[PDB]
UniProtKB/TrEMBL annotation:
Name by which UniProt lists this protein: trypsin
Matching Pfam families: Trypsin (PF00089)
One Gene Ontology CC term in the entry: extracellular space
GO MF terms, alphabetically ordered: metal ion binding; serine-type endopeptidase activity
Protein species of origin: Oncorhynchus keta
GO BP term (any one): digestion
All residue ranges annotated as the Peptidase S1 domain in the record: 1-220
Cofactor list: Ca(2+)
Gene3D superfamilies: Trypsin-like serine proteases
Residues that, per the record, bind Ca(2+): 52, 54, 57, 59, 62
Length: 220
């Protein structure tokens, strides 16, 4: 996260860290058994770390659970990152408490201008922002017009842009797979963008609201 602020500890209880030796992607707990992330973060097996704030220090609130199944969206394409969404099933159900809570799936697609929160342990591109502590940032959803204007012919129905064309505030590598929450619902998944926080290059996110059927069917 670039240009944000440190999240208050445990203020984003749905935020998870996908670990394979080290943190490599974020994710969102949607229920006691499933986690949503980005398809490009795929690995046959991964360790989901919940209840984290500082990923390098044991705080006593963490729950480390290995995956039992990792399912990429059937239409995911590594050529253009289309349909960049994935589901991870926990081998054992997560214990919901003060530090671990699921985020609700969208009941409708959020319109442009809606304010959201994006968080993660990715690159901060700062000397004062410690990436080991969960970082937070508020970003508005952009119109398709602005999105396509920034990335001509690269935006599909499964993508949306969020952030500021002015630059300076944006998600970045390491935040990938993480949540974009607006009005208490998971509207996006950190996917891609040109550089980070660069003017004219907003962040691109997987449009969760059009995957409700696949998500609910797969979680059955
Ligand atoms: Ca920790």
């Amino acid at each position: 996260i670039v240009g944000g602020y440190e999240c208050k500890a445990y203020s984003q209880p749905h935020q998870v860290s996908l670990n394979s030796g080290y943190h490599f992607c974020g994710g969102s707990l949607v229920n006691e058994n499933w986690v949503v992330s980005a398809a490009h973060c795929y690995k046959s097996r991964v360790e989901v770390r919940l209840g984290e704030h500082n990923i390098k220090v044991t705080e006593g609130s963490e729950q480390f659970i290995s995956s039992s199944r990792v399912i990429r969206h059937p239409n995911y394409s590594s050529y253009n990152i289309d349909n960049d969404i994935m589901l991870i099933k926990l081998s054992k159900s997560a214990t919901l408490n003060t530090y671990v809570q699921p985020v609700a799936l969208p009941s409708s697609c959020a319109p442009a201008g809606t304010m959201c929160t994006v968080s993660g342990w990715g690159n901060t591109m700062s000397s004062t922002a410690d990436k080991n502590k969960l970082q937070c940032l508020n970003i508005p959803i952009l119109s398709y017009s602005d999105c396509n204007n920034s990335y001509p012919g690269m935006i599909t129905n499964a993508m949306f842009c969020a952030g500021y064309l002015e630059g300076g505030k944006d998600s970045c590598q390491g935040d990938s797979g993480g949540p974009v929450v607006c009005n208490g619902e998971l509207q996006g998944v950190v996917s891609w963008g040109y550089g980070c926080a660069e003017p004219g290059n907003p962040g691109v996110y997987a449009k969760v609201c059009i995957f409700n059927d696949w998500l609910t069917s797969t979680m059955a």
